[PDB]
Tab-separated table of C-alpha atoms in Angstrom:
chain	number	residue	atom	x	y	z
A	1	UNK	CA	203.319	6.996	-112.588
A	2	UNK	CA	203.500	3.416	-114.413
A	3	UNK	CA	200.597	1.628	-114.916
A	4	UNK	CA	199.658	-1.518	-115.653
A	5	UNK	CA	196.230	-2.741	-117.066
A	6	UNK	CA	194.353	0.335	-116.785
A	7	UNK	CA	195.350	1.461	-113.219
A	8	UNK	CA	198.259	3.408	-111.213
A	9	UNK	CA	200.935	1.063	-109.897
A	10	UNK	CA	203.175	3.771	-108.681
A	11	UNK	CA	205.731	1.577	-106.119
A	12	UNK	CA	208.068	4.843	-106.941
A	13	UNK	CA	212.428	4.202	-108.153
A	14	UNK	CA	212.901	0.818	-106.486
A	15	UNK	CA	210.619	-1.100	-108.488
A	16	UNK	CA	210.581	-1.598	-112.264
A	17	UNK	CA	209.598	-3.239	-114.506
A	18	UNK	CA	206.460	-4.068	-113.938
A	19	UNK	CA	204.096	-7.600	-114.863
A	20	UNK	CA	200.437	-8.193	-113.992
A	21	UNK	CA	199.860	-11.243	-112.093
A	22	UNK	CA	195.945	-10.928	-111.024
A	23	UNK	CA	193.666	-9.336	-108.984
A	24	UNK	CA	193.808	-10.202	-105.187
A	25	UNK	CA	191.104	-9.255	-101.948
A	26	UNK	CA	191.752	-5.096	-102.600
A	27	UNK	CA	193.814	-4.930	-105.786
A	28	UNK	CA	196.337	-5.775	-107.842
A	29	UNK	CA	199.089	-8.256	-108.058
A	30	UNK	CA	202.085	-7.214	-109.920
A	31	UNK	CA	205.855	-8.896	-110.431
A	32	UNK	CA	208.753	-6.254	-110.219
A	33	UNK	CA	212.233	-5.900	-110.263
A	34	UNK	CA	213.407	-5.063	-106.495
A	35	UNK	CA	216.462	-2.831	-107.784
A	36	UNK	CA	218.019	-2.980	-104.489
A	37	UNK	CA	218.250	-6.747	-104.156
A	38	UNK	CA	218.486	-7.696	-107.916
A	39	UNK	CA	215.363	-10.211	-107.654
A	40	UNK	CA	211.711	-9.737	-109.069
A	41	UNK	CA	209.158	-9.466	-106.081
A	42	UNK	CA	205.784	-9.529	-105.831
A	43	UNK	CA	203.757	-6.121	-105.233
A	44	UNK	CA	200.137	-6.138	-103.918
A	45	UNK	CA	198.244	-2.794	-104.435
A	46	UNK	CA	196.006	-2.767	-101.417
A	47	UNK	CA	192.978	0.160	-101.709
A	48	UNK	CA	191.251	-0.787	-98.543
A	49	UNK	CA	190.573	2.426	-96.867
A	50	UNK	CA	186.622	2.900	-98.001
A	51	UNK	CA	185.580	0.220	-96.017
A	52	UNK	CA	185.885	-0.556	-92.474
A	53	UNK	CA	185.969	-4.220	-93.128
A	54	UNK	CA	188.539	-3.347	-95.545
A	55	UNK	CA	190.759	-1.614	-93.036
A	56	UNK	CA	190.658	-3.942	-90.445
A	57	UNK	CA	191.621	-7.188	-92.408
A	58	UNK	CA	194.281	-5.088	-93.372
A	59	UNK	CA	195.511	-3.724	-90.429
A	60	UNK	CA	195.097	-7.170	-88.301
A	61	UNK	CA	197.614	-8.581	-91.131
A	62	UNK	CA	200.335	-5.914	-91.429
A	63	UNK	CA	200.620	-6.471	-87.865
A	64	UNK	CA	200.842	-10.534	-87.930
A	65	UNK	CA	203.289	-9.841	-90.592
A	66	UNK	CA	205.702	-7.558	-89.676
A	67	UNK	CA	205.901	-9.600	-86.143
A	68	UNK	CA	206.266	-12.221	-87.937
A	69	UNK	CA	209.277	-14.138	-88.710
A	70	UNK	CA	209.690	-17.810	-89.975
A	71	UNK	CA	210.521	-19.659	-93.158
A	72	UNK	CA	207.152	-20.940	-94.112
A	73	UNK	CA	205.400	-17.875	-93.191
A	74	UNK	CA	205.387	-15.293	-95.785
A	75	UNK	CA	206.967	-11.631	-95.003
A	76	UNK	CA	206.406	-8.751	-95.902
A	77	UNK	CA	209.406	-7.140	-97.266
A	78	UNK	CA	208.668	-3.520	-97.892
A	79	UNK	CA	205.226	-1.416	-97.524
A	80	UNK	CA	205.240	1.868	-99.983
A	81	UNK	CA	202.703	4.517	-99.557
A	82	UNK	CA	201.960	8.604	-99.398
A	83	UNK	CA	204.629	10.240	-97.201
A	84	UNK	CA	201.499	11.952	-95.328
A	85	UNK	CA	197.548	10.496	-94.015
A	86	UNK	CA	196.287	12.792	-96.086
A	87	UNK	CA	197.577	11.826	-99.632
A	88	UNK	CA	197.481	7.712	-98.858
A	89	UNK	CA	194.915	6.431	-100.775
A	90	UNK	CA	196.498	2.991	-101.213
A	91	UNK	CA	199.299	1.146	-99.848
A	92	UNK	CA	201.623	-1.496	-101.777
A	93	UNK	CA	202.629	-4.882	-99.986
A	94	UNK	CA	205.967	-6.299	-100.978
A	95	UNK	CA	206.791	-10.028	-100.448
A	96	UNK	CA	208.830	-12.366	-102.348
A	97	UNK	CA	207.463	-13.851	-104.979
A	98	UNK	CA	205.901	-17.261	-105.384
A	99	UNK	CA	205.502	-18.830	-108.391
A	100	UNK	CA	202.351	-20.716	-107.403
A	101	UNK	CA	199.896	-21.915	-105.059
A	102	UNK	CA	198.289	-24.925	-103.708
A	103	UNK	CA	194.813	-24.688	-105.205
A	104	UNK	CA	196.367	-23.889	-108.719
A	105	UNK	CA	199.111	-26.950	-108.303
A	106	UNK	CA	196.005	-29.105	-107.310
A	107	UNK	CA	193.841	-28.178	-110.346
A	108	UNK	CA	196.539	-29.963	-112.505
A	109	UNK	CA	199.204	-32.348	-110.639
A	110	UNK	CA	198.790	-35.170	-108.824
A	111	UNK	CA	201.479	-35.048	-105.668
A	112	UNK	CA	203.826	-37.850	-104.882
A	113	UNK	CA	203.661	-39.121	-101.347
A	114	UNK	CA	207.175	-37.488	-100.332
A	115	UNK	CA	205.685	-33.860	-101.926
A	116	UNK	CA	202.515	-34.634	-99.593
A	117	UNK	CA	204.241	-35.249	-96.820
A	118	UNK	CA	206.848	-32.475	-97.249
A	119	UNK	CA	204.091	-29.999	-98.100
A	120	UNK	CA	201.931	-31.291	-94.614
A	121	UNK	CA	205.570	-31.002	-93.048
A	122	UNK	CA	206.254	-27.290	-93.895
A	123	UNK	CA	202.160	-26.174	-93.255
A	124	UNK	CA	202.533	-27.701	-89.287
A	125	UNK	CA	205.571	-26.288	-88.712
A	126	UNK	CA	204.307	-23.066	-90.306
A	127	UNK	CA	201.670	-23.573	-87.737
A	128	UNK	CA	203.266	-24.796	-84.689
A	129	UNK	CA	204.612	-20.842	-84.943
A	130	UNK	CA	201.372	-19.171	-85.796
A	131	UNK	CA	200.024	-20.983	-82.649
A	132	UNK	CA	203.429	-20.469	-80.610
A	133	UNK	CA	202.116	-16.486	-80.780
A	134	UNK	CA	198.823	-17.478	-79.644
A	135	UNK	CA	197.006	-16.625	-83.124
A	136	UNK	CA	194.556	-18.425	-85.374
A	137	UNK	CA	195.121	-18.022	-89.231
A	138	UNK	CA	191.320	-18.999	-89.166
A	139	UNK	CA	191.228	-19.019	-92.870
A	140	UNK	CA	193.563	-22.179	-93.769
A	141	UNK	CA	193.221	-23.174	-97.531
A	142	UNK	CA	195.164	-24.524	-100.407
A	143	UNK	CA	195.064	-20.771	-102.270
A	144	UNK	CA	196.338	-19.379	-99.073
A	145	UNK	CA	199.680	-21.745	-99.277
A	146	UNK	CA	202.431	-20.295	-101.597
A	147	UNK	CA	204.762	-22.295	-103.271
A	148	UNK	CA	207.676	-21.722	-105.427
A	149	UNK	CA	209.682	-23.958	-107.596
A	150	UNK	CA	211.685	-26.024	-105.331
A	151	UNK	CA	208.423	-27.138	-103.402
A	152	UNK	CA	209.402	-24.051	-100.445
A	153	UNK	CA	205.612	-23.446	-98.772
A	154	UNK	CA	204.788	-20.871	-97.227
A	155	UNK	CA	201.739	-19.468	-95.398
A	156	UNK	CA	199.530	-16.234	-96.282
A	157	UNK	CA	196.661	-14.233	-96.074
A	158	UNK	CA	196.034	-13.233	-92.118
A	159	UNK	CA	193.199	-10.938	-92.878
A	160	UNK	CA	190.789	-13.217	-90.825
A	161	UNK	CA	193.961	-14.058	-87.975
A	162	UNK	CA	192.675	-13.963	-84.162
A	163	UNK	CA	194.440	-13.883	-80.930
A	164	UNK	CA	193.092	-17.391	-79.269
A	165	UNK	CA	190.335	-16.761	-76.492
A	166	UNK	CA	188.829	-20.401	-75.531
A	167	UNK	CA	187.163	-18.998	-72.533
A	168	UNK	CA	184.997	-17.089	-75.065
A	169	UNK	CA	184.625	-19.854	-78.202
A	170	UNK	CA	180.943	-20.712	-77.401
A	171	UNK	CA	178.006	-19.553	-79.585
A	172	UNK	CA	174.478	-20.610	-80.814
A	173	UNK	CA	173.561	-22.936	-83.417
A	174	UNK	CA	174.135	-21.756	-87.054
A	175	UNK	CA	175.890	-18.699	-86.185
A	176	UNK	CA	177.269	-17.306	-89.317
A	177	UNK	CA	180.762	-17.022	-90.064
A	178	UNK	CA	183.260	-15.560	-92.261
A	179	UNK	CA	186.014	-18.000	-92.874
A	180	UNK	CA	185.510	-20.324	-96.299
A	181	UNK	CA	183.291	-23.121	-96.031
A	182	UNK	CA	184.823	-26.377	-96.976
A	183	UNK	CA	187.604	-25.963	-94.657
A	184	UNK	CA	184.996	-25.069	-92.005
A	185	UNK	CA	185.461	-27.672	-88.230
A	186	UNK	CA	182.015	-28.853	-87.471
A	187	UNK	CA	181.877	-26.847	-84.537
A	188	UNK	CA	181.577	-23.620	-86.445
A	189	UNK	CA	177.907	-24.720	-87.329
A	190	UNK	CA	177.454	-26.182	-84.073
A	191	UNK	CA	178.798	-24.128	-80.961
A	192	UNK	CA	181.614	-21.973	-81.499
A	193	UNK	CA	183.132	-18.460	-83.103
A	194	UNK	CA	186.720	-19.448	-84.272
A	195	UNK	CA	188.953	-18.830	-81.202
A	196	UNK	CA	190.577	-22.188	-80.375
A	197	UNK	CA	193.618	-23.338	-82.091
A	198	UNK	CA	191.802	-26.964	-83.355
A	199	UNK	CA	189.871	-25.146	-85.657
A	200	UNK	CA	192.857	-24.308	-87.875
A	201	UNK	CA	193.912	-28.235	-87.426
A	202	UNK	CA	190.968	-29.355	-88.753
A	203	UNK	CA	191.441	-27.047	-91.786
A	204	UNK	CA	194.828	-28.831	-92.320
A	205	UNK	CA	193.043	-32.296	-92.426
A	206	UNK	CA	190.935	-31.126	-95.224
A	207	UNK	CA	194.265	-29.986	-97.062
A	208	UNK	CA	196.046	-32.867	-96.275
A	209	UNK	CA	193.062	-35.134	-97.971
A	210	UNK	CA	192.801	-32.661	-100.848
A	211	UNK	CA	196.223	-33.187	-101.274
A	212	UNK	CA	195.806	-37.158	-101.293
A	213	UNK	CA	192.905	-36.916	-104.156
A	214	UNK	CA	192.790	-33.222	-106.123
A	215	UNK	CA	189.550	-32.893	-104.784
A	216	UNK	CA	188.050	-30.939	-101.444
A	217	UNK	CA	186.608	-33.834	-99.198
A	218	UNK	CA	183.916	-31.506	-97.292
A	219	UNK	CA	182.935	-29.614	-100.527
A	220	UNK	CA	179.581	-28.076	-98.930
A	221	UNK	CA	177.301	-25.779	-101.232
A	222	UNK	CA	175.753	-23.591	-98.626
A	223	UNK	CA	175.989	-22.983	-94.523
A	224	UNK	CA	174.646	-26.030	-93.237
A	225	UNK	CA	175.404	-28.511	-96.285
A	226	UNK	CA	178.614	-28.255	-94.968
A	227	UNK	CA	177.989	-29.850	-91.948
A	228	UNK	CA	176.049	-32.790	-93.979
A	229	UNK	CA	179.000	-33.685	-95.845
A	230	UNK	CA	181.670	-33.733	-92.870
A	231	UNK	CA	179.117	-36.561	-90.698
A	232	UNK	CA	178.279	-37.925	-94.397
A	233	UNK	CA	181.989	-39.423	-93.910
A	234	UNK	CA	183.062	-39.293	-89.954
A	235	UNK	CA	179.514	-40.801	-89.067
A	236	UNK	CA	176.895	-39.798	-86.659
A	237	UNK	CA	179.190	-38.390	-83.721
A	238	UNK	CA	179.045	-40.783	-80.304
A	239	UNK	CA	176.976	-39.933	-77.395
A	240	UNK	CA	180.460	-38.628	-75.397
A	241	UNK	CA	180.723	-36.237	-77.908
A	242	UNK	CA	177.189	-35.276	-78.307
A	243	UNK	CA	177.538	-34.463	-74.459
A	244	UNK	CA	180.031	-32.271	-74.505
A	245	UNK	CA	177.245	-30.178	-76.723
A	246	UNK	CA	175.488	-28.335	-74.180
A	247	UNK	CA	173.847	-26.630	-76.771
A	248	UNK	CA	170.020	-27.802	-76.738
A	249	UNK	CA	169.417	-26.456	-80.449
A	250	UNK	CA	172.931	-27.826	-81.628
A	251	UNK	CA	172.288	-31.475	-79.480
A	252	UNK	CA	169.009	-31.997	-80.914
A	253	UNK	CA	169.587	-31.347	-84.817
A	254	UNK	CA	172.322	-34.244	-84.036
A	255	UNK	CA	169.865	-36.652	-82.542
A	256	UNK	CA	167.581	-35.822	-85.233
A	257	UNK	CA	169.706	-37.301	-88.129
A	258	UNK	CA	169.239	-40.907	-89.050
A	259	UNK	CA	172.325	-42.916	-88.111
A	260	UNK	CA	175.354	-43.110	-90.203
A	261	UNK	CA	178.298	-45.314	-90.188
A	262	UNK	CA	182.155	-43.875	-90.706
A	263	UNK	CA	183.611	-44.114	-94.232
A	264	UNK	CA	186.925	-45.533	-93.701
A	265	UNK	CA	189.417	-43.692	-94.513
A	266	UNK	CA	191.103	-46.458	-96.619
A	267	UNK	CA	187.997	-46.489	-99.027
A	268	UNK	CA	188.277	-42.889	-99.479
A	269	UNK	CA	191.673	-42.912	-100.438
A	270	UNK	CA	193.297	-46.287	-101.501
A	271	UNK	CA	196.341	-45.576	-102.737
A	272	UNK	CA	197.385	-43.212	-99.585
A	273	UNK	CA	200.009	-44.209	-97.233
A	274	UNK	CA	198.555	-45.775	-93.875
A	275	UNK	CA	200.295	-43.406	-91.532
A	276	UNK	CA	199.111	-40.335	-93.612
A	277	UNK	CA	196.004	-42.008	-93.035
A	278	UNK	CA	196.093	-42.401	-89.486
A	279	UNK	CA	196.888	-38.578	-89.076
A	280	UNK	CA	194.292	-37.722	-91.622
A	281	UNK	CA	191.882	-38.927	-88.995
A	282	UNK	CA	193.459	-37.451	-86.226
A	283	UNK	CA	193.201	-33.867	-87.724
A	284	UNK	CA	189.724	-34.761	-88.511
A	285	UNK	CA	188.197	-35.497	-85.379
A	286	UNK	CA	184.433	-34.383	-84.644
A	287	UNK	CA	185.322	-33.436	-81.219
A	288	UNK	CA	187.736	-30.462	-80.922
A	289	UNK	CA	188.742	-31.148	-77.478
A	290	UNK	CA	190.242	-34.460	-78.612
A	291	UNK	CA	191.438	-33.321	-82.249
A	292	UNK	CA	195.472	-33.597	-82.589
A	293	UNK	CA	197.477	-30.844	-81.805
A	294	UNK	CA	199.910	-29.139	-83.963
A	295	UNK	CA	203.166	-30.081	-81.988
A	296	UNK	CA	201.786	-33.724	-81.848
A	297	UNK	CA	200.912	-34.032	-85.257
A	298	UNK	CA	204.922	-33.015	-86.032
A	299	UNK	CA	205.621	-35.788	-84.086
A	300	UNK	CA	203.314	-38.442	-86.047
A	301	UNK	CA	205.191	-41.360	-87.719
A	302	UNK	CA	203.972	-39.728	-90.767
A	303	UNK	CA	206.495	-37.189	-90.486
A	304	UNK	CA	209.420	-38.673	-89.002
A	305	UNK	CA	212.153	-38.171	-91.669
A	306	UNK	CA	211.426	-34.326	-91.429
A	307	UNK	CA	210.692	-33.860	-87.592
A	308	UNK	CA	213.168	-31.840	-85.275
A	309	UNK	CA	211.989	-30.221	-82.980
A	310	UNK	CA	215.007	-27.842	-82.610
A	311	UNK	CA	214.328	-26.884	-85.848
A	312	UNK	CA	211.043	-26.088	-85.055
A	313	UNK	CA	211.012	-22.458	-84.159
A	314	UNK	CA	208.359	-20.622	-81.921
A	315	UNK	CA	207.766	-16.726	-81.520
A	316	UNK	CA	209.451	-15.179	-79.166
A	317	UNK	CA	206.436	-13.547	-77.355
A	318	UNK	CA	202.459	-14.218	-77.514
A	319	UNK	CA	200.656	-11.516	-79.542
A	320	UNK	CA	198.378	-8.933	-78.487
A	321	UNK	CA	196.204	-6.249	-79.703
A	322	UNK	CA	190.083	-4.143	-80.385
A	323	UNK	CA	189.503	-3.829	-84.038
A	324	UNK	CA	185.894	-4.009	-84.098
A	325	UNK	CA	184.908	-0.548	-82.570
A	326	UNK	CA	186.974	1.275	-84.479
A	327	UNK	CA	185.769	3.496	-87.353
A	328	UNK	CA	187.505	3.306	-90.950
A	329	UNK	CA	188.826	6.645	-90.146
A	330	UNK	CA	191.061	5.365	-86.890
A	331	UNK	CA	191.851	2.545	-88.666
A	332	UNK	CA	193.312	4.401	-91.413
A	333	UNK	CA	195.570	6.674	-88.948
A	334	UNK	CA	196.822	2.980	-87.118
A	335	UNK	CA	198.122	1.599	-90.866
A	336	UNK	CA	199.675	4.448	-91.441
A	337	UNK	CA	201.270	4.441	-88.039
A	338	UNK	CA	202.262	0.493	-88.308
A	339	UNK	CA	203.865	1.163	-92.043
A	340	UNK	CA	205.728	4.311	-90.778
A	341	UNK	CA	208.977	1.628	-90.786
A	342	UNK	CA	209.281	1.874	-94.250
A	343	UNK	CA	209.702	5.566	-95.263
A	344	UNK	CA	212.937	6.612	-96.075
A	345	UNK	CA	213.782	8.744	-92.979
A	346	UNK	CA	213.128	5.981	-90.465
């Protein structure tokens, strides 16, 4: 079996020549030759199957994936692993490969207005999919957008993905969550689990203004700092929007902050373009019920030179699935199931 960098990286007669890229969530990132299609690819060596947590990221995401198809949403292109339960160990993700990401073009290029709004362009309609299928990425970020050379973007990483369930989004105050912090809607701290579709809009706001300065603009150090530094620039919310906080906890931490004005936008950012600007502050609106969604923001001035909405695709069907009751065991037996597509005998 080849190796690379001390471990096995056996992805068996179709992939050669091997290159380590990094280390990713459960393994290994490696460039290859795919010797069927005469491109390099990117390989993912995925050990996930001591941990339950483990095993259901990476189950909920082989699912997404292989359901899954649009142009700024990354595929998955082949899945090798043991021909039997009881010799997989690992299991190998093929995708195409990407020569970057946000975050990393961020640390070290400023973006042109048409890349911004290109890039914004390609994440919504990305989105307007995701949503189409009635699933939250949940876990929106500049790392988690793939780019390649010609500025093609496309979305990743659905290990935190959830089918949508308003009826169910309410929670206490300062529940904890898993999803990363800066990108984080103020409702997570306040009254709610994840499971409406504005909280993956606001975590496009927050990319589109990293994308307007190279730097996060919520960039909280702990659990409820976060929350500090998204009112430290929308302001104390109004009293319509503290109402529609039932939450007595939640209501009264607001009302217990001194009062702060808005930052304008302008200020923030003065060398952004005014319509970016306008849906900047759109995505990032305290209250979720009146945040933008994804469909309208395609249709914001901001985008007009790319938006068609024939060109727009949505998924065919919503999705469906619990993950959370079963053991890593079960879990194990259901990815080997859902990768069963890619033997050879199929």
């Amino acid at each position: 079996p080849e190796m690379v960098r001390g471990q096995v990286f056996d992805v068996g007669p179709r992939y050669t020549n091997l290159s380590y890229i990094g280390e990713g969530a459960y393994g290994m990132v490696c460039s290859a030759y795919d010797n069927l299609n005469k491109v390099r690819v990117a390989i993912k060596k995925i050990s996930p199957f001591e941990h339950q947590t483990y095993c259901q990221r990476t189950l909920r995401e082989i699912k997404i994936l292989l359901r899954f198809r649009h142009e700024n949403i990354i595929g998955i292109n082949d899945i090798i692993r043991a021909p039997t339960i009881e010799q997989m160990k690992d299991v190998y993700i093929v995708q195409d490969l990407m020569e970057t990401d946000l975050y990393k073009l961020l640390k070290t290029q400023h973006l042109s207005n048409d890349h911004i709004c290109y890039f914004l362009y390609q994440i919504l309609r990305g989105l307007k999919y995701i949503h189409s299928a009635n699933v939250l990425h949940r876990d929106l970020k500049p790392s988690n957008l793939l780019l390649n050379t010609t500025c093609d973007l496309k979305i990743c990483d659905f290990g935190l993905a959830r089918v949508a369930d308003p009826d169910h989004d309410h929670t206490g105050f300062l529940t904890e969550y898993v999803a990363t912090r800066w990108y984080r809607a103020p409702e997570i701290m306040l009254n709610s689990k994840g499971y409406t579709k504005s909280i993956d809009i606001w975590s496009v706001g927050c990319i589109l203004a990293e994308m307007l300065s190279n730097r996060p603009i919520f960039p909280g150090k702990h659990y409820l700092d976060q929350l500090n530094h998204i009112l430290g620039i929308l302001g104390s919310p109004s009293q319509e929007d503290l109402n529609c906080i039932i939450n007595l906890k939640a209501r009264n931490y607001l009302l217990s902050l001194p009062h702060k004005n808005k930052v304008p936008w302008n200020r923030l950012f003065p060398n952004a373009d005014s319509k970016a600007l306008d849906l900047l502050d759109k995505m990032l609106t305290f209250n979720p019920h009146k945040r933008i969604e994804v469909e309208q923001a395609l249709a914001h001035p901001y985008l007009e030179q790319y938006y068609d909405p024939s060109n727009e695709p949505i998924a065919e069907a919503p999705f469906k699935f619990e993950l959370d009751d079963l053991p890593k065991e079960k879990l194990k037996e259901l990815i080997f199931e859902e990768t069963a597509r890619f033997q050879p005998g199929y």
